[PDB]
Design a protein around this motif. Sequence first.
Motif, PDB file in Angstrom:
ATOM      1  N   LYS A   7       0.724  -1.167  -0.083  1.00 39.55           N
ATOM      2  CA  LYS A   7       0.086   0.055  -0.091  1.00 39.55           C
ATOM      3  C   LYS A   7       0.722   1.260  -0.115  1.00 39.55           C
ATOM      4  O   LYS A   7       0.617   2.179  -0.555  1.00 39.55           O
ATOM      5  N   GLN A  35       2.452   1.873  -3.511  1.00 41.80           N
ATOM      6  CA  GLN A  35       1.292   2.621  -4.275  1.00 41.80           C
ATOM      7  C   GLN A  35       1.098   4.032  -4.035  1.00 41.80           C
ATOM      8  O   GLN A  35       0.752   4.767  -4.883  1.00 41.80           O
ATOM      9  N   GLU A  37      -2.116   1.657   8.571  1.00 38.65           N
ATOM     10  CA  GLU A  37      -2.955   1.224   7.519  1.00 38.65           C
ATOM     11  C   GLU A  37      -3.954   2.546   7.025  1.00 38.65           C
ATOM     12  O   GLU A  37      -4.394   2.572   6.084  1.00 38.65           O
ATOM     13  N   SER A  62      -4.090   4.986   3.869  1.00 35.86           N
ATOM     14  CA  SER A  62      -5.361   5.038   3.044  1.00 35.86           C
ATOM     15  C   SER A  62      -5.875   6.544   3.205  1.00 35.86           C
ATOM     16  O   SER A  62      -6.462   6.697   1.889  1.00 35.86           O
TER      17      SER A  62
END
Lengths: 4, 288, 298, 57
Positions: free
Chosen positions: B23, B26, C23, C27
Amino acid sequence: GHRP
Amino acid sequence: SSIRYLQEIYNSNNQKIVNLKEKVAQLEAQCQEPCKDTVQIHDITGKDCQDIANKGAKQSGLYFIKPLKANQQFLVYCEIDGSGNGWTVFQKRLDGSVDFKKNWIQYKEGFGHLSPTGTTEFWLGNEKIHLISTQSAIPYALRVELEDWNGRTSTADYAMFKVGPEADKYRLTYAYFAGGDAGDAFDGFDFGDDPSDKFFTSHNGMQFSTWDNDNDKFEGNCAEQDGSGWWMNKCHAGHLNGVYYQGGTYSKASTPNGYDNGIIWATWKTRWYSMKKTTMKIIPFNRL
Amino acid sequence: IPTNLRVLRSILENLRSKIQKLESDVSAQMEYCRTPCTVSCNIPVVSGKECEEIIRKGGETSEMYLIQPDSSVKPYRVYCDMNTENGGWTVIQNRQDGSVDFGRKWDPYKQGFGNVATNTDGKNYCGLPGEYWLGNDKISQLTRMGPTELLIEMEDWKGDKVKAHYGGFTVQNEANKYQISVNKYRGTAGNALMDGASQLMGENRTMTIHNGMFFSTYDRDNDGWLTSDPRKQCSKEDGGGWWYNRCHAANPNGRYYWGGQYTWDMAKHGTADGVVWMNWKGSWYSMRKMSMKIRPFF
Amino acid sequence: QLLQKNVRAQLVDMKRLEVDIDIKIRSCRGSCSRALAREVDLKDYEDQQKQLEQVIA
Ligand SMILES: CC(=O)N[C@@H]1[C@@H](O)[C@H](O)[C@@H](CO)O[C@H]1O
Ligand SMILES: [Ca+2]
Ligand SMILES: [Ca+2]
Ligand SMILES: [Ca+2]
Ligand SMILES: [Ca+2]
C-alpha cells in the motif's frame, strides 16, 4: 495636469 | 504457570506488514508529480498577437512573440476576439496591486505579472513596445480602454502608433486621433486660464520619463513628482501609469506633492478622478 | 520466566494497533491524492538568461521567474532569490518541509522535479519557493555558460544556520555523467564538498570528497565503489541523487527526517541517508532547511 | 517451550516502517490536495523496546  | 502460545498475532502482523508495504509503494507512485499550475503558455508563436491570430489561435492568453528585429522572443498577453483580431496588450491596471513608481530600467524591461486570465497589472516594457510597433512597414494602432468605478467603459484610438528606440528616449508618436468616447487626452487639455496649458499637457512626440531619467518639458521632474513613468510634457492630460486610488475620487490633500498623480484621462473625467481599470493595447492599423 | 507472557502479549497487541493506525493513515492520504495540489503562478514580465540578468533588469523581488538561458533552450521556470547577499541567485535545489520525494531515479534527476514556487497569502504570484531539484541538464547548461559560483545554505531545528560558499562551480553534461567540480570555498558549514568529513581521517576522509565525482541515482550507479555486488551502492532505493564518492560528507538531496536527530535503526537501509552536512552536525542529523543557489561569477 | 522472542525483530521493522511512512506521507504535501497531519511516537516504541531485553535477562 499643467505646471504654471 | 500457563501454557498458551497463540502467536498467530505475530504471523498475522508480519503478513499485515507485507501488505502494508504494498500500500505504501502505491501511495509513493501517487506522490511523484508536482502541484498542477493553472498558468500555461500557448505553443503558437509569431511576430505579434495578430500574426498569432492569423495562424489560427482563438484564445486570449499568454504567448511568446518575436518581432523580426528582436534578439530574443518574449512573453505577452494576447487579446483575441471573435473576428480574428489579435491585440498585444502592453499595459493593464485593475486593482492597485502593482507599484508603478519604477525606474528607467524597470520601465525599459517591464514589470508586473502576466496571466492567462488577463487579471493582473503590468507594464510590458518600452523596449518591447518599441520592437512591436516599429516592425518594418506595418502601421500600428493603439487602443486605450478605460473603466470608471460605476462599470462604464470608454476608448480612445490613435493611428500610426510608434514608440521610438532607447536612443530617442522611447518617444511616443502617432499620426492622428482615430476616435472614441473617452476623448483625445493625448492632445492635452484646456484646464484653466493659462493659454498654454493644453499645449503643455499634450503627449504626441513626448519622450519617456522616469524619476531617474527626466526627458520632459518641465523645469522640475514630472515623473518624480507624480510617482510614475510616462511620456511627460509639463506635465500631463492622460496619465495611465499613475497612482491607483480606490473609489476614483482623490484630492490635492491625497498627494505628497500636491499634484494630480492618479490614473487620469482629462477628456473623460476630471483629473481628480482616478480610473478603476485601464488597458493599453496595440494591433496592426488595417485590422480597424 | 513466569512473568514473560505479560509484556510479550501486550507488545504484539501494541504493534497490531500500530499497523491499523498506519493502515488508516496511508489510506487517508491516498484519498487526498485523488486530486493534486494546485498553484497559479502568473509570470513576471521581466525575464533574462538567468536570475542575475533579471535583477540587473530591475527584477528585485524574490519569486518565480521565467528564464531562457539560450535561444536554443525552451524558457523555463525558476525561483530567483533577490535578497540573499547581492541577489541574482538562481535556486537549483531547495528543502524546507519534506513535501517532495527526492528518492528518485536518473530521468527525474535529469529532467527536474518538485515545486518551483507556491502562492503566498492571497497574492496572484508565487513568491515562496517550493521544494525542488531544477534538473541536471538545466544545471549543467547554466554552470557552463560562464564562470559560476555556488551558495549552499542550511538551518537546523533550533534555528541556527551556516553556509558553504564555493566561488567556482561546474556541472558537466549527461555524456560526462554530470561530473561536479567546486573550488574557492569560504563559510561556516565546513568544506564538506572539497575536504570530506571533518570527523574522519586519511583514506576514510578522502573517500567522502564530492569534488570530481559523477552523479548517481539508485537505478544508475556512478559512485566511487567499483565492486561488482549490488550490496555496495551509495544510492539505494528511495535514496537521493548526489555526487557520491564512498560515500558522502554531505547530501542535500537526502531523506527529510523530522526534528533533525535520527539513528541507523530509523533508516530504510541502515545508513546515514538524511539531509546531511557532516562537517557541521554529523551523519545522524538531518537539516531543517537546505538549499543550493548559483550565479555568474564576477 | 517456544522461546521465539524475535518480537524484538518485528519491533525494529515497525520502527523503520513508521519513520518510512512518515517521510512518504509528508512527500505527498507537494503532490496532493491535502496533507495528513500526523506524528511518530519514537518514545512509545523505545519504552517497550527497553522492555523485552529487560524481561529476557
Ligand atoms: C583504520 C580506520 O580508520 N578504520 C576504518 C573504519 O572506521 C571503517 O569502518 C572502515 C570501512 O570503511 O574503514 C577503515 O579504514
Ligand atoms: Ca487654458
Ligand atoms: Ca524636467
Ligand atoms: Ca522515491
Ligand atoms: Ca559502484
